[PDB]
Paper text:
dArmRPs are currently being developed as modular peptide binders. In these proteins, a varying number of internal repeats, binding the peptide, and capping repeats, which shield the hydrophobic core from the aqueous environment, are stacked together to form a superhelical repeat protein. Designed ankyrin repeat proteins (DARPins) are another class of helical repeat proteins which have been engineered as an alternative binding scaffold. Here we show how we applied rigid shared helix fusions and the well crystallising DARPin D12 to construct a crystallisation scaffold that exhibits ideal peptide binding on a dArmRP binding surface without interfering crystal contacts.
A crystal contact was found between the DARPin paratope and the dArmRP binding surface. The first helix of the DARPin (residues 145–148) was unwound and formed a longer loop instead of an α-helix. This was probably caused by both the crystal contact and its resulting forces as well as by an altered interface between the shared helix and the DARPin. Tyr150 pointed towards the interface and made key hydrophobic interactions, thus stabilising the changed interface, instead of lying on top of the interface as in the designed model. On the other hand, the interface between the shared helix and the dArmRP aligned well with the design. Overall, this results in a Cα RMSD of 2.3 Å at the interface between the DARPin and the shared helix (residues 112–168) and in a Cα RMSD of 0.6 Å at the interface between the shared helix and the dArmRP (residues 150–208). Although a target peptide was added in 1.5-fold molar excess prior to crystallisation, it was not visible in the electron density map.
Residue numbers in the entry: 3 to 397
Write the structure that this text describes.
């Protein structure tokens, strides 16, 4: 008539390893429940008795037993910060997204206390970071900015990067949307995207025939390329330039615009990074796009060329050798005042080179038009024409 169930509950909670073993051998119900539904596994998880947790599971304990609140052993181990028990429970099939009667999941309980190693393990095993409880609170809400956000962000970005390798374009697309959102965050977020390993996957996606994938991938890449020179170098080192140059032949004008914007951002870096753009063969396509009827594409190519021409004399000469000057001089007759200003800036950069570069500018007939625009009634164009003529005339 011994109450083996009661004795087992008490032995499990007290950490009496030998007594648990003996009670189980004598037929105690491993899934005994107390007055509010706690099983021996609940109590051992709460108290942190790893050996007893393992013995109970070996003897068939229900890893997902619910008490009357809906708490599982995983809830209790997460709440109490018992990391090794969390791992053992998950290894034995614990429900990582189980919710109690008010919608609380194990991740909520780990986050609220700052059990950040458990947070990491739960996320690694598929815990949902956006899970909301009865009052709309996510685990992030309950963490109160205790370091949870960095751990969750690391996990969210690495999962998004892995989805870029999926074999469904819709999975790739929705992941690119979220990565694009992160890249939109500017310098305070972009390094997290780089550190998640996104750049190689983004570059590889530039071979996709799916134009929506190309558009979202380029959007993310261009924003990363708007960072510092070390971030530009990561884009280059990921292999972006040959793929970007290929896309300058795209029939899609949005892809064309985004590719030029990304190339212009890269070309806004250091001299070696300008040289990478040249070495990838971008200049022929850039010069051809100066004839584009689309003014946004025209202006984006103009700006990229001006950035390239902000480099050394040999890089300026590469622009000249690609035939840019006749097209640039033509653009000084543009009715559009933005294109006129950007053409003056690019030509001024070219004119800031050496004697050889200055001579090509004069032979292209730029002096006639620079001195004419020196008196232009628009002050901005007047400035650029003045400064450009100065660069041409100095040294
Ligand atoms: Cl533990
Ligand atoms: Cl922890």
């Amino acid at each position: 008539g011994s109450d083996l169930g009661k004795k087992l509950l008490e032995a499990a909670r007290a950490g009496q390893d030998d007594e648990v073993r003996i009670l189980l051998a004598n037929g105690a119900d491993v899934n005994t429940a107390d007055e509010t539904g706690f099983t021996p596994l609940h109590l051992a998880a709460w108290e942190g008795h790893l050996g007893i947790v393992e013995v109970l599971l070996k003897n068939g304990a229900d890893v997902n037993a619910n008490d009357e609140r809906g708490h599982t052993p995983l809830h209790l181990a997460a709440y109490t910060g018992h990391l090794e028990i969390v791992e053992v429970l998950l290894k034995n099939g614990a429900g990582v997204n189980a919710t109690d009667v008010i919608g609380t999941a194990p991740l909520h309980l780990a986050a609220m206390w700052g059990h950040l190693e458990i947070v990491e393990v739960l996320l690694k095993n598929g815990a949902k970071a956006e899970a909301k409880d009865k009052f709309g609170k996510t685990p992030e809400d309950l963490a109160r900015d205790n370091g949870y956000e960095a751990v969750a962000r690391l996990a969210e970005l690495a999962a998004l990067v892995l989805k870029l390798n999926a074999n469904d374009d819709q999975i790739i697309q929705e992941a690119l949307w979220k990565l694009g959102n992160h890249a939109s965050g500017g310098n305070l977020r972009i390094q997290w995207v780089i550190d998640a390993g996104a750049l190689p996957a983004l570059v590889q996606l530039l071979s996709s025939p799916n134009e929506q994938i190309l558009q979202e991938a380029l959007w993310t890449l261009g924003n990363i390329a708007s960072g510092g020179n070390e971030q530009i170098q990561a884009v280059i080192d990921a292999g972006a330039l040959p793929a970007l140059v290929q896309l300058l032949s795209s029939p899609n004008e949005q892809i064309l615009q985004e590719a030029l914007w990304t190339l212009g951002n890269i070309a806004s870096g250091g001299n070696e990074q300008i040289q990478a753009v040249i070495d990838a063969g971008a200049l022929p396509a850039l010069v051809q796009l100066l004839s584009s009827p689309n003014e946004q594409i025209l202006q984006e190519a103009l700006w990229t060329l001006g950035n390239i021409a902000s480099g050394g004399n040999e890089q300026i000469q590469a622009v000249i050798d690609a035939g840019a000057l006749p097209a640039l001089v033509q653009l000084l007759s543009s009715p559009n005042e933005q294109i006129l200003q950007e053409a003056l800036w690019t030509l001024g950069n070219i004119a800031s080179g050496g004697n050889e570069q200055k001579q090509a500018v004069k032979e292209a007939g730029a002096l006639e038009k620079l001195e004419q625009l020196q008196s232009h009634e628009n002050e901005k164009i007047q400035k650029e024409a003045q400064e450009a003529l100065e660069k041409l005339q100095s040294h």
